[model samples]
Target: DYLLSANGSKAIDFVWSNFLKHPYNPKLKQPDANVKAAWEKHADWEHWSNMGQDWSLNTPSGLVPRPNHGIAHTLRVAQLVPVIAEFLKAYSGDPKFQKLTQKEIQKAQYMMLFSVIGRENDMSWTDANHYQQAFKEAYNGQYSKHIYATFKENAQKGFLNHVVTNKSSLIPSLFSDESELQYWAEALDTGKPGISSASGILMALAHDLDLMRCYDKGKFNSLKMKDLVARLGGNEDAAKKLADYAHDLIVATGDRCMGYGVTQDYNYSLFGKCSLDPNECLKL
Candidate 1:
């Protein structure tokens, strides 16, 4: 359903192959001994290839499986990273991005793609250090070694900062490596001047997309623009523009609020439930 150029398609496929090489056993859930063994070897390609399955939580209500935040969600976000990068390059008013060449843009996309490789589906909502786990997996994974070899420090910074809500806790020196990616990592580090760097913009886009998903599911009362700005390290202007762009991309495209039923009346209080009756929802 997602339309993309040949290169963009190629990029997605490349990342998908590498993603399959990593183990994805959800938190607090145990797999059979054979599956666990394969995971330990990082050779569970068959297990990882089935991206359509959802992870379930055992609650008093029964086994409730999560519809979002699974492999599907991961792939969706991966597809979005490059598309959003291209969107900002073409439409954002920020001057810092206007000079980015196609090659550099693709590099940024690859880095973001690699950063999301090890995101754990379970404990994502409850674990404060989940991003750290993802970082360790991506950094030490067997596949995509070439990316780490070249964009080592910046790639590390992106993996660490992308899902972190607080910017102050990040160590500045961790991103000190000097390269073109250093600026991208720094932008992610401070959450300011993000409009000027590829990694920063990708980070915002990924987070906004996930937030929009949750909002569509009625998990949030609103988009939380103020908190988003704070997470972006006080880049209010860039945060505003990025949120609108994300809304259009995810909402206007009919890509959100999955599994919710038919048309219902729109009210400000029911903003996130747009899938019920999109006609009544606020016009973007």
Candidate 2:
């Protein structure tokens, strides 16, 4: 048996190591549905990114799918990591909207997302269009004024809540949980020596930048509260551990689940750095 006890992606190693799977069963001693919720797994990365979880490398690589941030997840976050601090203090939360306002929230949302997409470097109506489509898709209409009272109310000081509650933010937020600290800290560990699917994919996306800008060229501005994911890659050596665990039904066994996602070798910051007009997104 090709023993994968030592080889999974870097993130998987963390899951195996921290989640009590280090001494894993070569075969399922029992079903591991719980691993679904474990830290470092990030299996639902696309959904997370779509939810304004900024700085993650969720897009697959290709010419048409052209991501705003560079190619890999790690590279994307790395480009973003240094800038997160200043971006945080810019909010005051005093501007309570009593109901979510699409204008106020989408401003931060689209700008932040646009920056990751590297559109801010050359702002234009065309770029604006990209963000317009992006905001609707990501927030699932969370920015609308009339859709939900909670959303509208949140928009009042959405900025305040953004920096306060979003630990997933690339920027630091207030009162972040103890658990999340471990989550991001472990995700940055590249020495674990393997191709973790989530982190590896992130790295691949970050690798797509123009090098000179490194994604810092007035790029990454914002419209909302905080969170994002990261990744790193050394090589394509993840098969060993994948065979041992990886839930065949979920990733392999012809189940066709959203296994590891499609290949968008690019970055996908969750928020778009522009605003959408009312119903500009809510067409029937």
Candidate 3:
């Protein structure tokens, strides 16, 4: 102890160098071995594939525009909703997300999940079902019939369950503008990474609740959202309900995941299969 007392700042700097900084951020001078290992693991297609997606419950779906979102349990897994939305926003805005490689997309996705929802955890039946039921209540009901129809139609056509190439006509129709379609193609310009059509609808509907949770109603409304709302036409009640429902689902699901001032669990269960309704847990 006396030896280090001669140069206290130097001694303290030693501890700071070893453990004070975050291992994930690359800007730091010293790379952490654990973080580097995880980063390398993330680059592997097989490892990245194993991460659950929108449609798949427990395993990798090998497809994009996932319809299900893996059982409604993992909130971070739900980050795809806003991630793609933000990507689209940047897409239309010109340069934020344009020409990004798969690695960049994947890295941003990890940053989103890790930073936003605080990492993946197991889906509790109560939490999972509650949020998914919220989804059904918000989108599947009479208030947003067109949304339900469009989502279902796309899913049937392999939009949610299969890998899509820019060579297809399906995804382009899902968006209101060709600009969005153009961006979607660019986002998927990777070494065969997954993309999902379902994300656009989710993003469009999640106005004000856009990814990053930056509440901006104007920036929130995309051409797709406007189109979907136009489908509500003359039903004032349905329109209000649609807005309220979307708000409730995003807010409540997010709250339950890490809201109400509750701390999130980074360590979570990896088991459980949530069905489309998410009420399977209740039935049994």
Candidate 4:
């Protein structure tokens, strides 16, 4: 009932387009202008000077969230249109995810979840802490060392740094209190001993893309991966597709500039400029 379709009907275009959904558009070729523009916009942004601009525009202009790169939110919602419809159509099933191996059930207890990448420009320690608690409640640990190892193996070399891999170094400094920080550490450590989680995959993507630095002065802890197989509901088919997507996203975009879209340097090159610790992160 909205617009014309490809067949030229005056009714609705129910089946929307999902350009890169299935095979996860590798986009291995050079990125387009929009991708280039995004990082330029980020670098040009006077973040410290215009702290209130984000809040003002978000509130006054009625500007809803938009994607920084690749797809727009409108497209994302359209992509989810079928997903929402399918969920609604399944009106009478047992609506809980419970297909874990016995070992996973004992270890996970109930915590198997997908990871969500945060907004590129504004996510922070506060934002990540909220996820940490939720992940611990469900997964009982970070469960993502294998995930990090995988990242170390495949991620563009420029993106990773000493701090990115060291768990202790990434602890959020502005935690609400000490216990929350400890909880994060415990879960991250526990989760990694075996394998990674879905959330861990996102964190790996974030780090590999050099987006974690976009969070609150670069202090946010990238969420840990936990229960990769179980997090994908223990379905290898779904798992492989997801892994492929995250993998390709990194491989394709990792070397690009960090957002605000204006830097000439690769995101990783900028990391060497951070003088946080003269001995550790500064020189390297």
Top TM-score: which candidate number? 1
Model 4: residues with Cα > 4 Å off, grouped in runs: 1-74, 77-228, 245-284
Better of 1 and 3 by TM-score: 1
Evaluation by lDDT, superior candidate among 2 and 4: 4
> Residue 123: error of model 3 in Å?
28
**Every candidate's CA RMSD:** 14.2, 22.3, 23.8, 21.9
Give the alpha carbon lDDT tens digit for every residue of 1-284 in model 1: 22143433443454344442234445334433443444445442333323224354233323323334322334445445656565555555445555655555454543444444433333332121222233345456433222212223433443444424323222222222345444544433211123634556555566455455545334332455555455455666655565555555444423343212221222222332322222222232
Worst 10 residues of 3 by lDDT: 110-119
lDDT for 179 (candidate 1): 52
Spell out the clash pairs found in candidate 1: 263-277, 264-277
lDDT over C-alpha atoms for residue 113 of model 3: 19
Q: Write the per-residue lDDT of candidate 4 for residues 135-234, one digit (tens) a residue.
A: 3434545432232333223212211222234324223322234464344333432112123542233233233223322222123222312233344445
Off by over 4 Å in 1: 1-23, 30-67, 82-92, 129-196, 216-284
Off by over 4 Å in 3: 1-212, 218-227, 234-236, 253-284
Candidate 2: worst-modelled 10 consecutive residues by lDDT = 272-281
User: How much is 227 displaced in model 1, in angstroms?
Assistant: 8.2
